[PDB]
Design a protein around this nucleic acid. Structure first.
Ligand SMILES: Nc1ncnc2c1ncn2[C@@H]1O[C@H](COP(=O)(O)OP(=O)(O)NP(=O)(O)O)[C@@H](O)[C@H]1O
Ligand code: SF4
Ligand SMILES: [Mg+2]
Lengths: 911, 802
DNA sequence: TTTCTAATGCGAGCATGCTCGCATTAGATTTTGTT
């Protein structure tokens, strides 16, 4: 059997790992250069098969090695003597069908893509299992399920409008058309190496039989047990069986065959390849990832087995939480459109603006932060300032406008370094204009020097250059496609050695040495996910496929069948040739192991570990230096860890020596601000310095998020009030209000109305209290020494001063808030006390008076009793104490009522 | 078939008591089993399941278990799995299915959505991917909005109200006629016209009817994006189950026994989603047992109505079986857990009683000291005993006022005190560094970095830095001048300019200039990364900082190698938010800040430890944990009764009126008879609506008491911090005093008589001033001249050589 | 630089007893839920 001049048909089968895939190669080599056909199952398999055969063979001719779908396409080619467009057709067909007045229970569902996708699935499954639409309508009449017959008539309507998964269905009748075309190929091909028969469709199975009526020889190969994806490998045809693994270890083969016992199920591993199976667990979702990283790193670095010979065959990548945690420990892992990619988008915007001929400001900034001419934020903050020195304006010009004018013509005021960061943009935006007669895109690409930079970035970020070049090459390919198919282009484009994590289904072509089957969770691997829907596709597919179930919709729409699920794991372990590892988790607080973990633990070689060891420097040093600084445990291992840290820091590995340790860093100065003196205290400053000097420092100096909008509106109202008649103020506020950043358009109007009412309240109060108080001055500055031996010399600005009716001086200050302060805290107000102190010491022109503290919002006021020398001395003492507190290092950080909004809160030690 | 007792003794467990006998022997039919607190739930569950599967009424694949919370569902699943597996030994392939309610509703939608116009592949929103969207639709809404409220504070009302429409199934179309009935009545002593207060209540109703368009805009915005929240999801499931009977027929065919575990904590959205499917009038062959406790309803009245909602399908109600014998101390269960009788339990294990102690102190500090002393002496007596380890814990009402308990216990005890993911100092530095990289005008981040442990600066250096930063500004009044300032463009003074152009090296301290230069080089290195994808940029920043090593370098040797779980969960969240409608290195920080504002940071890794630690957890949380002696410290006038934060339906514009609340548990404000008549009638309805708030605190207090595994140290303070008035002991304590003093079983301690209070302040000098130093000296001496560390180090160096 | 809502104790307004605006001050309750 299986020899030159042998019989027309022969059957080949054997357990996984056996030489079946490479067995068929030899009989092809010895045998015309043509007349041999190899049907593998996937074009990725074609690469390996053709490579093997050709490299085992100057005038040698490539044997025709192809796939079932490709062969059906070639059959249709001789008979001539995509999913996106498919979905478009189907959705428009349903939209049309919605016109006239399906069982009507689902009329609302027709507009939805959810129904279109399920209908796509139903038709695809029907075509793959080879049932005509008329036959399915007959099924819908026989079994009283209206949706089925409706879908059958829909399929009938679908096939009307035509005359990629129907190639086999077409070829099945294409062969029968001539009935002599069959003999043309039966006399042409003699060998027909059809292979991997467990993965063939029932329709494609018919084509194989048709091509194997009788001539020459044919071979069918494949394990008739890992059929999960239903084969019929039962006949009187001659059969060859293989029972030596050649890949898996007898320890591994033991476990796999023990699994297969509860399901030719017998086969033994290669004796030479000694290996093992290990079952492990973890105590959390992260412990599993880090221990997989641990095991992979140890296997790579102690056991010598490299990357590209390991893998993590998980159930199905929905999964993604594993590549990250597995890369963090330093394990390479293998594997979003051109519109999203930023390097492509930048040059795309250049092309867009070149085609348009006009550059909006809001699109010139967007290519200063791109990769064409790149500017970081604190260089945009240099461009802004430098440009606003070119043309000093009383209100500064908008940055977008300044930038676009600078680009189109260069102002050379500062231009120190910013000459080049604008020169690149000049070059690109001009050379793009240079042609104006595609080729222009290449010209723009060349004008900017980013190609040379990226190709000189082949070092270390070097990955980013590779990604960017991939994106730009894809863009160029799209451009070529459009040229062979520029305002029409911009909207045209709008629409190795590494551990390889991959799902089980795609992991059926692996020759790996170390398989780690992550995620054997209970709700995941034996799937309890219901298979049902609205069209009953799952219940129809098994009644259609044989008599897997009678015309009852009972067992199908419950869950995937375990017998159909254990085969997956059984075939998954078969890929590992040396070692396996089945990893599941079980944690008390949300997770359990599957019913398969316990069974696998029977044939395995050997308190789930809660924080597993890792092999990575940033982990190992953080473990070592964690024991040496221990209060008391590991008395001698402390010395061992000290020696190991010495060896580590002798070479590198940042974090080892106490120079790098954070808790060993030392303060820079430890020296007073003004050890020498006179220190100036604006009245507002004293009101924070009497509460939290740390807050004074860390906020008044640099720690403030910066200029909210309730702060500039308040000062704007202050300025409107200051100038010396309500009716004329409102029209000053109205004209300027529009250039204020508010989040909500409807909010802007409400705030404008409220602030107009605020001005009106101000004028009402003013004309009310002119009956006893007269305004000496408004917005009068305050400046002059008050207490001094350190002196303070308060300086600041006063909102409004007033002369009392009977020889005094009442100082006020307008606040634009809604929440007044209490009447006892407004008796001890630091600001007003400071103003009265400044008045009492002259420098305004003269006696202490009250402090009104008028709130414009809602007009309530909280007065302060005019000072006395009995109290004034205490206030001077307080001011002196505050001034002394400004000086020394180690500022106190007191807590107070205002400690709930201070911007420096993430750094104070009192918290 | 086997009887319950015979079946139980066939296994390795004790014979179930009489209470656990009736429910197990109950015939298949809709029944409810009121299970007391501590009465041994989630074991009777497995007993009933194994009874059914052994007598052969249903195979394991036909069982279904529903439970409100994920952890309790996991517990039930584990218990059921082990019981079923053990039964296989004494007289297989499939297993139970256990799911939390919302997961079951999700599965129901994904299996039968299209019968409704509901997409199957609808993303689900967290509480911070929603707010960041409901604040967009409110911002963009065109109109008037005569409301006088800040945006992002009407977003709160829109979310709260739209979170109740999708719970009582109202759909915003019938919530437009609710104010005419009251306005017409109010508009038609003294003849002043309607009182000022009355118009305020009407204003709220008009405001709600003005929000209605905002509520409707949000729903369409979510439909357009194929996006759905938890409330909308469960409401959709309820609508589907109510409208279509074939889904119920399918589900009753597939599942022959259903386990509604926590049925007293489920609202009107699920009460109808779960009766319509199975229990309405369906076959009596289905088991349908439900074990609720009506007294302990923290979260939020379906139990009093289960009968006549899940009947025998002939028009006859369902049975009711009880569970007592709470496996709890007599003193707590007897005379104390009867604090709330209001029903219009027994000492189970006949075990030794326990002391119960009350106390009225004269200061929050004093009461804190008293409770701390009691717990401390209890803990230390274990050490002399030989490690008894009482592992107590304190139940506190407010989420605050529990941090200082760590201060008062770390002196003698060792507490855990079970901070969001964005308050752990391992992550906050990463967020701050990201912020400083992305946008310079962030002083609250520049300080967190300049004064951080990695390189401390002095006041002199910060002042000099800010001096250079303000000198570099060089910017010279009018209203157009003011408004032109503070635009999205206009520039100001920001420290992140000095760090990049420090200037002359003389001004800074000689040590502090090198640090400035190094930070400048670091930031100029990183700011080149903003073009990179965001999940890679974050890890690059973490690598550049020392966070990965240092988060481990500060950890007890007890814990094995942990420390980086918070960082890895944060990078997971980053890797999830990213690749999702936009890279957005600067719209990530908007997400992080919005998450800080609402939902209080995020969910940390929740590390577990197994020491003899005193937990400081909150009473509202941790239901079902019954471990050791517990104490409730604060029972003063306004802390525990908490009846101040009450906003009824007539003032809060984001609360459903009783007339429309499909619960109708409260009174419906008849108002049919007719202003002084009405003005009095409202206040009575408000007072009735207030007693519900009190009735929601007995259940908190009853839950707290019924966790007293060993003894109690409940107490009540006086003269709380930072106030003016005594705030004497509230309700729940005076009555608790009386109920204590008429029995064997309480002790009264110090009972401070009710009387100027504290004004002492807290301080901490800024730049702070040892085991670390001695270890550093040891390492230095080692440089000068087990666990297998040598091989690991050799392997790492062999990697380095290459 | 900045605040929601409400409970409190007046304090004139008029059929000594309420009674109702009017101005002044205290606190900002807790989590459960998908793949
Ligand atoms: N007799 C043999 N002697 C040496 N090496 C062999 C022999 N037979 C097969 N191999 C090797 O085994 C490798 C695996 O190829 P092969 O076993 O033919 O794939 P396969 O096992 O059929 N795929 P599968 O379906 O999983 O069995 C080949 O690449 C050969 O190197
Ligand atoms: S939170 Fe309090 S202690 Fe900290 S800086 Fe602010 S005011 Fe000072
Ligand atoms: Mg002012």
């Amino acid at each position: 059997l299986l020899e030159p001049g042998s019989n027309g048909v022969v059957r080949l089968l054997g357990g996984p790992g056996t030489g079946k895939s490479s067995l068929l190669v030899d009989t092809a080599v010895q045998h015309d250069p043509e007349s041999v056909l190899l049907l593998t199952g996937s074009a990725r398999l074609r690469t390996a098969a053709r490579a093997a055969i050709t490299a085992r063979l100057g005038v040698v001719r490539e044997p025709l090695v192809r796939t079932v779908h490709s062969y059906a396409f070639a059959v249709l080619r001789l008979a001539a003597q995509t999913s996106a467009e498919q979905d478009g057709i189907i959705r428009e067909l349903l939209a049309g069908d919605l016109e006239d007045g399906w069982p009507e229970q689902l009329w609302p569902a027709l507009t939805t893509a959810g129904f279109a996708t399920e209908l796509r699935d139903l038709m695809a499954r029907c075509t793959e299992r080879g049932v005509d639409p008329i036959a399915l309508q007959r099924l819908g009449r026989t079994a009283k399920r209206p949706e089925w017959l409706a879908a059958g008539r829909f399929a009938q309507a679908y096939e009307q409008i035509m005359l990629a998964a129907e190639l086999v269905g077409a070829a099945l009748e294409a062969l029968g058309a001539d009935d002599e075309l069959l003999d043309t190929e039966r006399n042409r091909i003699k060998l027909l190496l059809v292979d991997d028969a467990q993965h063939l469709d029932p329709q494609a199975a018919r084509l194989v039989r048709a091509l194997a009526a009788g001539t020459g020889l044919t071979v069918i190969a494949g394990d008739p047990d890992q059929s999960v994806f239903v084969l019929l490998r039962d006949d009187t045809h001659p059969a060859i069986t293989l029972t030596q693994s050649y890949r898996c270890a007898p320890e591994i083969a033991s476990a796999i065959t023990g699994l297969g016992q509860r399901l030719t199920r017998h086969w033994t591993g290669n004796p030479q390849r000694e290996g093992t199976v290990t079952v492990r667990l973890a105590a959390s979702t992260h412990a599993e990832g880090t221990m997989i990283a641990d095991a992979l790193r140890r296997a790579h670095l102690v056991d010598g087995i490299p990357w590209s010979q390991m893998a993590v065959i998980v159930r199905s990548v929905p999964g993604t939480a594993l590549a990250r945690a597995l890369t963090a420990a330093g394990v390479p892992v293998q594997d979003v459109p051109v519109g999203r990619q930023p390097a492509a988008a930048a040059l795309l915007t250049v092309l867009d603006v070149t085609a348009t001929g006009h550059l909006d400001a809001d699109s010139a900034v967007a290519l200063l932060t791109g990769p064409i001419g790149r500017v970081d934020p604190v260089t945009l903050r240099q461009l802004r300032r430098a440009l606003r020195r070119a043309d000093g304006s009383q209100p500064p010009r908008d940055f977008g406008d300044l930038l676009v004018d600078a680009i189109e013509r260069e102002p050379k005021g500062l231009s120190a370094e910013h000459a080049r960061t604008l020169r690149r943009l000049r070059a690109v935006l001009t050379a793009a204009r240079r042609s104006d007669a595609r080729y222009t895109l290449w010209q723009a690409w060349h004008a900017s020097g980013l190609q040379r930079r990226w190709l000189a970035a082949s070092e270390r970020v070097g990955a980013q250059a590779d990604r960017d070049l991939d994106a730009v090459t894809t863009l160029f390919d799209v451009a070529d496609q459009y040229v062979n198919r520029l305002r029409g282009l911009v909207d045209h484009v709008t629409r190795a050695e590494a551990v390889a994590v991959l799902s089980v289904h795609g992991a059926l072509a692996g020759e790996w040495d170390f398989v780690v089957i992550a995620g054997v969770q209970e709700g995941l691997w034996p799937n309890m996910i219901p298979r049902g829907g609205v069209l009953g596709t799952q219940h129809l597919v098994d009644v259609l496929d044989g008599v897997a179930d009678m015309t009852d919709r009972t067992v199908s729409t419950r869950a995937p069948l375990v017998a159909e699920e254990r085969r997956l794991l059984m075939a998954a372990m078969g890929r590992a040739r040396t070692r396996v590892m089945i990893t599941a988790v079980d944690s008390d607080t949300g997770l359990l192991p599957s019913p398969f973990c316990a069974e696998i633990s029977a044939w395995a070689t050997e308190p789930p570990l809660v924080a597993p060891r890792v092999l990575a420097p940033s982990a190992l040093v953080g473990r070592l230096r964690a024991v040496v600084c221990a209060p008391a445990v590991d008395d001698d291992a402390r010395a061992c860890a000290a020696a190991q840290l010495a060896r580590l820091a002798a070479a590198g590995v940042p974090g080892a020596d106490p120079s790098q340790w954070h808790a060993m860093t030392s303060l820079t100065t430890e020296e007073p601000l003004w050890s020498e003196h006179v220190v100036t205290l604006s009245p507002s400053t004293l009101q924070m310095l009497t509460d939290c000097p740390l807050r004074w420092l860390l906020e008044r100096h640099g720690g403030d998020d910066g200029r909210d909008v309730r702060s500039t509106v308040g000062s704007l109202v202050h300025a409107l009030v200051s100038e010396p008649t309500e009716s004329q103020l409102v029209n000053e506020l109205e004209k300027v209000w529009d250039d204020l950043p508010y989040d909500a358009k409807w909010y802007s109007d409400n705030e404008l109305a409220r602030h107009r009412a605020m001005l009106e309240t101000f004028t009402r109060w003013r004309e009310d209290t002119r009956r006893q108080l007269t305004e000496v001055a408004t917005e009068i500055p305050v400046e002059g020494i008050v207490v001094e031996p350190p002196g303070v010399r308060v300086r600041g600005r006063l909102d409004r001063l007033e002369r009392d009716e009977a020889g005094r001086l009442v100082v006020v200050d307008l606040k634009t808030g809604k929440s007044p302060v209490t009447k006892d805290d407004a008796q001890n107000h630091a600001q007003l006390a400071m103003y009265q102190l400044a008045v009492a010491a002259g420098l305004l022109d003269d006696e202490p008076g009250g402090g009104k503290l008028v709130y414009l919002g809602k007009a309530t006021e909280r007065e302060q009793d005019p000072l006395t020398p009995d109290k004034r001395a205490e206030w001077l003492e307080t001011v002196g104490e505050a001034a002394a507190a400004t000086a020394g290092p180690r500022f106190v950080a007191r807590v107070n009522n205002g400690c709930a909004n201070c911007p420096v809160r993430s750094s104070c030690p009192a918290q | 078939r086997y009887s319950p007792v015979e079946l139980s003794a066939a296994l390795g467990l004790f014979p179930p008591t009489d209470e656990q006998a009736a429910v197990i022997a109950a015939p298949p039919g809709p029944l409810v089993v009121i299970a007391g607190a501590g009465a041994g739930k989630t074991e009777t569950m497995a007993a009933r399941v194994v009874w059914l599967v052994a007598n052969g009424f249903a195979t394991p694949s036909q069982v279904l278990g529903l439970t409100f919370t994920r952890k309790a569902a996991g517990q039930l699943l584990r218990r059921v799995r082990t019981r079923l597996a053990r039964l296989a030994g004494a007289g297989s392939d499939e297993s139970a299915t256990v799911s939390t309610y919302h997961a079951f509703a999700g599965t129901l939608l994904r299996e039968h959505g299209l019968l409704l116009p509901v997409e199957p592949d609808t993303r689900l929103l967290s509480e911070t991917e929603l707010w960041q969207l409901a604040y967009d639709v409110v911002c963009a809404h065109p109109g008037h909005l005569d409301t006088e409220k800040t945006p992002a504070a009407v977003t709160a009302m829109v979310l709260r109200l739209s979170g109740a429409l999708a719970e009582h199934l109202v759909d915003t179309d019938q919530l437009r006629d609710t104010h005419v009935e009251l306005e017409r009545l109010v508009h038609t002593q003294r003849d002043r016209g309607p009182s000022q207060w009355l118009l305020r209540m009407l204003a709220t109703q008009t405001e709600r009817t003005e929000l209605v368009p905002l509520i409707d805009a949000l729903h369409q915005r979510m439909r357009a994006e194929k996006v759905m929240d938890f409330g909308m999801q469960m409401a959709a499931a309820a609508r589907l189950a109510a409208r279509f009977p074939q889904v119920g027929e399918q589900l009753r065919q597939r599942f022959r026994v259903v386990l509604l575990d926590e049925y007293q904590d489920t609202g009107h959205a699920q009460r109808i989603a779960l009766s319509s499917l199975f229990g309405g009038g369906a076959d009596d062959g289905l088991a349908l047992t439900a074990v609720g406790d009506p007294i302990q309803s923290i979260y939020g009245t379906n139990l009093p109505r289960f009968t006549t909602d899940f009947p025998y399908s002939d028009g006859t109600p369902a049975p009711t079986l009880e569970l007592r014998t709470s496996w709890r101390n007599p003193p707590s269960t007897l005379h104390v857990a009867n604090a709330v009788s209001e029903e219009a339990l027994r000492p189970r294990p006949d075990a030794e009683p326990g002391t119960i102690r009350c106390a009225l102190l004269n200061n929050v500090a004093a009461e804190r000291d008293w409770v701390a002393d009691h717990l401390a002496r209890a803990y230390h007596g274990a050490i002399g005993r030989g490690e008894a380890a009482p592992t107590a814990a304190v139940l506190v009402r407010r989420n605050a006022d529990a941090a200082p308990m760590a201060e008062a216990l770390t002196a003698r005890g060792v507490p855990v005190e079970v901070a969001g993911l964005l308050a752990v100092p391992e992550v906050a530095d990463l967020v701050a560094m990201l912020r400083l990289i992305a946008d310079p005008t962030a002083g609250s981040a520049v300080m967190r970095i300049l004064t951080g442990p990695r390189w401390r600066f002095g006041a002199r250096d910060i002042a000099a830095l800010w001096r250079r930063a303000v000198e570099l500004d060089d910017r010279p009044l009018g209203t157009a001048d003011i408004v032109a300032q503070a635009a999205p463009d206009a520039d100001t003074a920001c420290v992140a300019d000095a760090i990049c152009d420090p200037g002359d090296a003389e001004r800074y301290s000689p040590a502090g200039y090198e640090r400035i230069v190094a930070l400048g080089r670091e930031l100029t290195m990183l700011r080149a990364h903003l073009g990179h994808p965001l999940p890679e940029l974050v890890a690059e920043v973490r690598r550049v900082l020392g966070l990965d090593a240092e988060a481990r370098a500060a950890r007890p040797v007890a814990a094995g190698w942990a420390g980086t779980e918070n960082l890895d969960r944060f990078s997971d969240l980053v890797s999830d938010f990213a690749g999702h409608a936009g890279a957005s290195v600067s719209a990530l920080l908007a997400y992080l800040d919005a998450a800080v504002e609402v939902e209080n940071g995020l969910a940390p890794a929740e590390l577990t430890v197994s020491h003899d630690r005193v937990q400081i957890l909150t009473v509202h949380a941790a239901k079902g944990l019954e471990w050791q002696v517990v104490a409730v410290p604060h029972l003063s006038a306004r802390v525990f009764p908490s009846t101040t934060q009450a906003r009824t339906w007539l003032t809060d514009a984001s609360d459903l009126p009783p007339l429309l609340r499909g619960d109708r548990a409260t009174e419906s404000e008849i108002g049919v008879p007719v202003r002084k008549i009405l003005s009095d009638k409202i206040s009575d309805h408000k007072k009735s609506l207030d007693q519900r708030r009190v009735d929601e605190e007995r259940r908190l207090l009853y839950v707290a008491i019924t966790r007293a595994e060993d003894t109690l140290l409940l107490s009540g303070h006086h003269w709380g911090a930072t106030e003016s008035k005594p705030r004497g002991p509230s309700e729940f304590l005076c009555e608790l005093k009386t109920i204590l003093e008429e029995a064997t079983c309480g002790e009264i301690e110090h009972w401070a008589p009710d009387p100027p209070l504290r004004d002492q302040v807290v301080e901490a000098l800024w730049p702070p001033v040892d085991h670390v130093h001695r270890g550093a000296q040891l390492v230095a001496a080692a440089m000068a001249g087990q666990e297998g560390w040598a091989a690991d180090v050799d392997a790492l160096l062999a990697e380095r050589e290459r």
